[PDB]
């Protein structure tokens, strides 16, 4: 009964570091042939609040959106708990999110002092201190901006192509 259509069919998706969350308070998902990943956890796939989180990542990173994974995305951008209750859904979005010259508008967080807690969101852009000298908010050697653009081109390999992800947690 929940109106997921606004989430899955949204015209624009968030960068993974600034992942979007929508609060809502199931047969159409299986019959979709566009979904390339569909994995549910802690529930029989066949609820007070349901949270729909959505973002874009690269194809070879979709595996990190699962309980117990590691990598830049799971570590620094979007982290699921070990006891996750919900579903992860993804589909290739090369046709919407790639561009011949390259689409660079989607970002991910490249540096962080510690790993995200589950469902934590970090949208800060503090200069990252990679060495012993403090940075005082100034970019320079060992003092780095912490976000990095994806480079989505339609002729890249599928693992480098953009995927839209929706995480439904109950």
């Amino acid at each position, epitope marked *: 009964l929940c109106p997921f259509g606004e989430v899955f069919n949204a015209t624009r998706f968030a960068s993974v570091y600034a992942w979007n969350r929508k609060r809502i308070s199931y047969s159409v998902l299986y019959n979709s042939a566009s979904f390339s990943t569909f994995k549910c956890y802690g529930v029989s796939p066949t609820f007070t609040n349901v949270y729909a989180d959505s973002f874009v990542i690269r194809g070879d990173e979709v595996r990190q959106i699962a309980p117990g994974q590691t990598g830049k995305i799971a570590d620094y951008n979007y982290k699921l708990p070990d006891d996750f209750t919900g579903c992860v859904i993804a589909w290739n979005s090369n046709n919407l999110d790639s561009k011949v*010259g390259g689409n660079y508008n989607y*970002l991910y967080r490249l540096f962080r002092k510690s790993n995200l807690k589950p469902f934590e969101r970090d949208i800060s852009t503090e200069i990252y201190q990679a060495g012993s000298t403090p940075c005082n908010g100034v*970019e320079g*050697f060992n003092c780095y901006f912490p*976000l*990095q653009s994806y480079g989505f081109q339609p002729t890249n390999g599928v693992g480098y192509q953009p995927y839209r992800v929706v995480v439904l947690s109950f």
Partner: nanobody
Amino acid sequence: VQLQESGGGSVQAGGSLRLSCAASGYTVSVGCMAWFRQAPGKEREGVAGIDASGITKYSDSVKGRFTISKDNAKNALDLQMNGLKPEDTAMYHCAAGLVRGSCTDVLDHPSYLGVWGQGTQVTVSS
């Protein structure tokens, strides 16, 4: 967080253009930022870079003709292009946010800048 370039188009050889890259969620004043360009089927070239200290570097092909500067009123990075040549025809691309190395080599290392705009086409006709 994004960079948005504008100011490109068509111009006669010998003419002038000013590119601008408006930054959202990114403070240009304290940033390392650069302009690159790519002519079709050809290798990307760094044209002008600037560091937090206000120190600029130019490629040999544009020195004496281009000036890179920070606009802190609009929070944008500007590129003044004078004495334009058919040579200069290319997609011009702005990048910001040092993620590796030092700002002084970014013209040779575009991957050392994390955030990239969409590009703006400049076509110089003879």
